[model samples]
Target chain A: HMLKVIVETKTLVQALGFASSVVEKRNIISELANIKLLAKDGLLELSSTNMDLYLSQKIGVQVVSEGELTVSTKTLNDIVKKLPDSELTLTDLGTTGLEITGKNCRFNLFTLPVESFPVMDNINPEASFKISCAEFAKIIESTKFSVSLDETRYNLNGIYLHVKDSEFYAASTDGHRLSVSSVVLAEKIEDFGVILPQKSAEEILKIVKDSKNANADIEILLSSNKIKFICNENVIMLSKLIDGTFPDYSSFIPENSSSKLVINRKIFADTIERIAIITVEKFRAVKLSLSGEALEISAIGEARGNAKEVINSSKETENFYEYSGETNLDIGFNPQYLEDVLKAIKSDLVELYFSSVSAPVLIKFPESPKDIFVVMPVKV
Target chain B: HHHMLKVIVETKTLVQALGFASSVVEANIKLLAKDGLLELSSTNMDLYLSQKIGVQVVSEGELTVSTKTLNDIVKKLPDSELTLTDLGTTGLEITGKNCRFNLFTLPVESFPVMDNINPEASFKISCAEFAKIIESTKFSVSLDETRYNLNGIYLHVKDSEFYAASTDGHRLSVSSVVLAEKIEDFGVILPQKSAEEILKIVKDSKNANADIEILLSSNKIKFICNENVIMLSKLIDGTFPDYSSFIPENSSSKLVINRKIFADTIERIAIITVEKFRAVKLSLSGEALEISAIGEARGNAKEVINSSKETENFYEYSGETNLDIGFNPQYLEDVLKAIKSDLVELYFSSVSAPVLIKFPESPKDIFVVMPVKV
Candidate 1:
């Protein structure tokens, strides 16, 4: 099939870079190096996937001829950038060869026949239900950090989506830290449960963020096999229902042995950051020493120096406890995780729940279960 | 041992004098503190010795001098001036209320005595004007020595005024200050370093200016003042190009555009232009003057500025020009860096001709450059 379109080259290049991570590497059964492009009606659709994250972007193209073809994303991006601000005409010259021409430059890019390109199987478009882009972004922001990165533990790799108490809930856990956020569904569907892989959730957020103030809506639909987020002209379809049951988070959450401290979120976070710099890679540990009216946070990196900061606190408890914990928290994870979660959480005070020295410490934003963070303690 | 060393000075006052001197002095030296006097000197072949006031000389001897030791001693002292004395030529005697340092000194003969290298026709000039003239033209001096002639500025007496001219071939910067009278046969090609030293030394005492006696006859020129003398040897002797012809006398197309507009336009266009060829083409025809530059590889933009002059003598050409020109959006931007003005008159003969830019009041203080051919 054949199609013609004229638009800014910058727009096309940006869409390609955004979708590059999703495209798979080739290994037989028609090389995966080519991206599928479809021109029909008033729009041009581009789609790519690598068995993990999936992405698609649709641009308004005036179609002279309707057709579908697969072209190398790299070659198209390079050719487009060099052409001046003139009308670019694209035509499928039959047999998977696309002709692109502008004012002074013309390019003949090799394209794979659409028949050989892999179209994700089992996409039930009829079952889709729409959700506001903003509301969906909120859920992903709260739960994405908790998704497990361990490839062996496939069950924890996806965020668990289900309906609890007439509210749609999204929750994730890496076996140590867990986060759960929920939004009230205008109309709760019957028997809803699906685990969307972490990668798909990430790519979807990228598209929504680019939409900026554009009047965009996210239509979500889920089946036993896959899930789709149709956002305005763009669509993110992903394989879902990662096979396994998430841990019973209800019991994993800590209960008592309470010694709560209410400190300014920025002051407390900054102190922890200063302490983390003196912490080692694998054993990044900060010891929380609680005394009357004052809290001392300290950490020591074996090769580097040690740091201790005494931050004033308001919340008072009858018993004061000094706890030291350790786990293999990512090197940059020490400060970054706290900053990311705290930035989205609009609360002056946060409650830290401690169970034992090695147990993951619970971080609960005051009165709002819409966001929660559980960080594993480091041994000092 | 206490033969010729006995002085008492407050540490606080001595430190201030040393601090000012240290700005001009090199770092590594010796400080001799002993008996009741403290003597400080930085002898790096060329020695800088300055004695602080109010030193009670009680006894006498010799000691070495180190700048680091004196700086440290003064910083830790109990905010009082100290005393220093020469306990003979062998060493220096340094003293404070509680501490004493006997530092060994190098022989006085070893310190190179600054000789009057420049012979005859020595005259005096205001140090403030001397410093100002040097500051204006020093930046144009070429760093390379192969172009050795350009490395030293041409200081000569011309038309009852002292003039300094420096150029790296492409652009020439010349500044002049009125002298009492033009003395014939009085000229010197002072090296870039000597010019810079003159500015640094006389920068503070602008109002209580010093009269510098400049001798410009030998290969080494000596600038002598009441307090200090700088004798700089090794001056380059090469025929400097007649830069007077480069200054355009008459131009067909001239526009007194806002300096802010010109500088801003050129700066913004420069961002998109290629780094190696930072070329921006200007097309001035009729009432509008356009400055344009090509974007990375694809897009290009041309900014049209409204000109008050209604002329149609604009010429078109291509390729980057000889001396690159940047408008600071003000007249005499480089010379009067602190002062701000709105407009600078630009006189262009042709697209390839050298463009002369200056303030409306004084055309003598003008900067001339070969326009970019593009």
Candidate 2:
């Protein structure tokens, strides 16, 4: 079964790189660590999977004779990455392995039997929707950092995605904090939601980030136990859905607050970062005391010392009556939680709604209230 | 008894000096205020670093504080002059623009003082050259604990020239600088930690061309830089091997190659090699050279590049039609990354021995790496 094709070195290398990332580590069944390659009808198809997460890509190539083969993902990737930028010829030597020749460089890679490759089952999606890749990337970045990594709790291991009120919402929580980012969708998808694993969410973000067409749409498909993402019409990524119910994060957020304050995003964030060092290293608790026109941020280190600085508590540098007089309260929080949402807020100024020292405080951008962050306070 | 101690100093220089002091020190750093100068000192028994900052001294006293705590507080302090005072309390109070830190402190008696050593030989070295000499040979120092002598750089004087050399039995690196005046010659083994500390200090020097004073003795060494900063280190007490005897004075074949392109090809072809044992092959001929590597059962890669053009500097083969050799990619990569020259000269011993490498212009700097014999 001799087959031959001429393909661009860089194109082939890029496709192989994406495919190999799916089969990252070696497995007990060695075949699981290899990529399945099929050359036919002017197209080269490559697929790799660890039985749970799978990726498939097709690249156009000059077909000489249609054939198929399976080889180690790393070996093929390493050799071709160093190959010359010129066109390379790949030949399948029937009973032998695969031969790749380009310029003055030549390589003979050992291949495995086709029967050893795993049979990946195809999924029939009950629901599918098209969303802008750019907006989707924003949704992933804001909430993915809050996903719980504890293996014992599988329900919080991924970002819970759902469609509500014609807007798509991605929410993640780790019991201490909750992050939810939403964007209006062009079309509504009702009764659809899935808990996408953290790894799958990250890979989708990477794929979307590197797409040639930034303004294009990504097609998403969902089933009872699986989810798939298609980008640029040539790449498809399928991952298993966690078989556990996600916690109802909406109940944790308060409906109203007695007081509110405004501050610059970067200035408040920088203040917390600087003062965090003065806190007890283990607690990293920074206290915010609001009374007059200014707010005092302070931290006292048990072994070192204490530091405090007061800055404008209102955006207009006015008295507390401008926003609300009831916020003359003291609250403590993890400096990291405050810094995370500050980074996610793209606006210049952010709004903070506080309900007493016991309930979680809400942080949101003045322009967009759809994307909000709720962080519980630590004991002062 | 209470001793009055208070001082106010600028922020830039103090912060910068303490930055390096933290990396060089792990214990308490003493702050001594006397005669309008405040000095911060820390030592690890092998190396001692101290920096003096000009300040407004209200009284004369000293105290030691946890280096980690002080460093953490100093970083968070605003970019303004800080007033540090004893205030007759067990804790030291430091006040900046709208902030204060009363850090816990220990009495000045708790800090160790590095004893001064009478110099046997003292000389001045250019800051750039000192850092360059150490950078070239520091990687060759043996990490094995069995060879205590090989875990340091050998600094010696030869023919009125200052030289540095280090070897790990597999490769050798030697760099040198000429001296203006001839003085009593001396040789010493500077430990790896001491060498690394020198790099950190030299990186902080604002002027690279400025000269720094260095003194060498039979047991201790001292370096004075930036006029106010000083470092004292004890030389490693062991005998270094006679590495000069291992250099091949003559060779039958030599290859002239571009340093950047050669390094690139080696790095690329090394992808197939699993470890040092899966050595890369060097197939040398008259004009073109090929470097290749194999992975036993996986696959192999080969890349060829033309040798740099030469009129008559041993471009013709001497002994055989085709010469072949094997070497660990890491050894070659190490020298290639450190060498600043554009053109690299490689001399083969024409047998199963070490190969020599040097730049055409800087013949004084040389390296010898053993061929991988599998």
Candidate 3:
């Protein structure tokens, strides 16, 4: 087959940048390492797939012959990057190679036959919905880091998305800490839920963030086995959904607590950081002792040293005064877990809920109760 | 016996001294506290570096400590007056504005005894001038351990003239400068590592125009400046090669081109070059130069650079003479970067002979690169 196309250097580079991420580096099949380039009807389409995920982009080009070929992603990108910012021409040499010529330099890179390349499966979704790019990006960022990294627990390897009535919710947990965030959608959609794989979520987040405007809407189409994200007229991403049921995490979140404390988020985060300096690797736990209006954070290293800092609590609620005079509530927690939860709260004032010394602590922003964070305490 | 010392110095001065001293000494080092100066010295078999920094001494004593530990402690301290006290048997206590570090020290007698070199000949030179000469020629030093003699820069001094040369057999670079001071004739081979350390110390010194006193003994060389910084290195025992014969006197063709344009063209052509020998071919016809690289399984790239009439002294060609030569792109790039002039003169005899690159204004610095058999 013969194919010829002329395109700007910048446009080609941008399209390759989008398609290169899906190219598998350690593939048993050699054709998987190559990205397919198709030219037809004045449009040049570049696509790459790693069996589980696929990405493709279409850019305007001056097409002379309509044909298709596949070449190594890395080699093509390197040649395009070194060429000058001018018109570059690509021509297929039948079964031999592909010739790429610019104003001053010409390169003839070998190509693989298009018939050997794997076909990417297209999805005809049963349900579809639209959401603003900004809100979707925020939901991904809030819960992406808490997804379980253990391969054995397949159900928790993705962020769980649940839509009910007019609210859209996302939650992720790795057994020790959990993050849940929800936002009010503009339109009411059907009640449904899906567990989007972590990798797919991250890639979708990047595309939505890279959109031209904050108000740009991303159309998401979901099926029983696959999901398709149509970012714009030129870009589309598809990925297979994980074939497993997500665990019910609602029971893990505490409903009622005996003690509630309100303090400045920044002050509490800074105190945790300073006390963690002397902590040893084996024991990264810091003890927080609360009594009356004083909160003391301390960590004692086995042989290195010990540091202690006392911060004044601004307000305390319910059952905190009954035991304030005689008994002090002492609880142990991993400093990093507490720090992460504190950083996620956007308000200046943070409300902490505790029922007992061994129970999980729920952290929330006073202004926004919809976003909740739960952290399991470590045994002292 | 009890040994103790206390000193309070500016944070900037102490930090600078510690940084320089830490770079020189890799292992354990000795700190000699005297009435007004503190000497930090280290010896690693053949290389020795010593620097006496100014400090307010409350008591005088000497102790040895790990270079890495002291450097780390000083780096973490706040930028304030750092008080260091040697508590003989306990350890060394360093107190800053808000932090205190207790470091363990070794006995002073355990430190290695450095050799004292008596100068057979000595001369003074500008720090900037000496640094420039070293920077221009050190990149060509041989890194192959099999060629022990070629692994060092051959430094020659005679009648107020200084010359330095290095070669890895593939290419040779020699640079010369006229010193302000006249001295007796002497030549020494400075090891590659020692030469690099000396350049680093001189560049970090406070005064740019400081006169550095260079002392040459039969086996040792010392560079001292500002009475606080001193770098001593052991000379290599082997004899350097006779590189004077490598320079070609006459060539069949000569081409003058803009240094920037030629260098940039070579860099772009290098993108298509494979890792094997890094060979790139250059063809000269009439007044135009073309650069190209061909990969066996991969593709080939070619670019033509047209000659410009910017230089008034540009040579005029009448007859037809076409010459094609192949060279390692790295070697050509190195020589181009060393030349400070805008225009460079390239002289070539044949495809197999060595090429000569010279700066039009400065005739003392000569660079010769052998061609690759491509």
- Which portions of model 3 show Cα errors greater than 4 Å? A93-96, A143-176, A179-183, A190-217, A241-380, B1-115, B205-211, B311-320, B339-341, B361-364
lDDT (0 to 1) per candidate: 0.60, 0.80, 0.78
Task: Tell me the tens digit of each residue's lDDT in model 2 across A267-348.
Answer: 7787788778767757788998876577788888776666777675443422222346564879999988898888886777
The list of candidate 2 runs beyond 4 A from truth reads A1-17, A24-27, A61-65, A78-103, A211-213, A313-323, B55-61, B76-80, B85-95, B205-207, B307-320
Q: What is candidate 2's lDDT per residue for B108-159, written digit by digit as tens?
A: 7767888789988888888888887898899999998778888899998877
Clashing pairs in 3: none
Q: What is candidate 3's TM-score against the reference? A: 0.82
At residue A68, give the lDDT of candidate 1.
Answer: 82
* Residues B282-302 of candidate 3: C-alpha lDDT, one tens digit per residue: 888766777887776666777
* Rank list by TM-score: 2, 3, 1
Candidate 1, which segments miss by more than 4 Å at Cα? Answer: A8-14, A26-30, A51-54, A78-108, A124-129, A212-215, A313-340, A343-347, A355-359, B1-374
TM-score preference between candidates 1 and 3, better one: 3
Give me the candidate number with maximum DockQ.
2
Q: Who is ahead in DockQ, 1 or 3?
A: 3
Task: Please give the fraction of native interface contacts (Cα pairs under 8 Å between A and B) kept by each candidate.
Answer: 0.00, 0.65, 0.27
DockQ (CA atoms), all models: 0.03, 0.55, 0.27
Interface RMSD for all numbered candidates: 15.9, 3.0, 4.8
